Design a protein around this ligand. Structure first.
Ligand SMILES: [Cl-]
Ligand SMILES: [Zn+2]
Ligand SMILES: [Zn+2]
Ligand SMILES: [Zn+2]
Ligand SMILES: [Zn+2]
Ligand SMILES: [Zn+2]
Length: 222
């Protein structure tokens, strides 16, 4: 697709999130770069409103799958790049086992050379002594397969996966992505993305933050 040509090199990224979980409002901003040729994302996130009222790892999935590396034989299945530069809307619900849920809406699109992911998140029904509001999560390495199928009536895709974070907390993620523009997109055969991520800290950063390194690779079609 033509969208694909936009990702041939290193692309700067801006990520922005306004959130409200059980009435606790906050905001996060992040920046870095993506290199789809390697499926590689490197980002640093800051909580601009002070202390994050939820654990950083619970926000990773919310905080740009257009940077996935699609092998050559699968490139006709890359919906995400095909929707660019006009972009796509990503809507998710995340159901935390025995606890609350997040509902999110994001617009992912190019603003000139910058890929911008602008998000709103609302979280409800969380328990005060649950794992999310009680901040009980580890902060290490994860790998999850992200399953994708076409949603042809909406000219987009439907996505599902599970996460697990050690305290273990389970979450079911359900996602729908729809193009912003009216032009043609690639509607994929069923496949999945390997999503491998590592969180860390910047030793010189005083603000509440997260450094993220992520490698995303499409698979599941022989
Ligand atoms: Cl994986
Ligand atoms: Zn925490
Ligand atoms: Zn809004
Ligand atoms: Zn493992
Ligand atoms: Zn989790
Ligand atoms: Zn994997």
């Amino acid at each position: 697709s033509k969208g694909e040509e936009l990702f041939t090199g290193v692309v700067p990224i801006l990520v922005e999130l306004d959130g409200d979980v059980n009435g606790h409002k906050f905001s996060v901003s992040g920046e870095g770069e993506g290199d789809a040729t390697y499926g590689k994302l490197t980002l640093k996130f800051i909580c601009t409103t002070g202390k994050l009222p939820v654990p950083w790892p619970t926000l990773v999935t919310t905080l740009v799958q257009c940077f996935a590396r699609y092998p050559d034989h699968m490139k006709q299945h890359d919906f995400f790049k095909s929707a660019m530069p006009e972009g796509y809307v990503q809507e998710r619900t995340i159901f935390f086992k025995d606890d609350g849920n997040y509902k999110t809406r994001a617009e992912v699109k190019f603003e000139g050379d910058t890929l911008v992911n602008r998000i709103e998140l609302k979280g409800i029904d969380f328990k005060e002594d649950g794992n999310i509001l009680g901040h009980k999560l580890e902060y290490n390495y994860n790998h999850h397969k992200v399953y994708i199928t076409a949603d042809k009536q909406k000219n987009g895709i439907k996505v599902n996966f599970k996460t697990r974070h050690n305290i273990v907390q389970l979450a079911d993620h359900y996602q729908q992505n729809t193009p912003i523009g009216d032009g043609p997109v690639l509607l994929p055969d069923n496949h999945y993305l390997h999503t491998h991520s590592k969180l860390s800290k910047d030793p010189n950063e005083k603000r509440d933050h997260m450094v993220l390194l992520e490698f995303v690779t499409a698979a599941g079609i022989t």
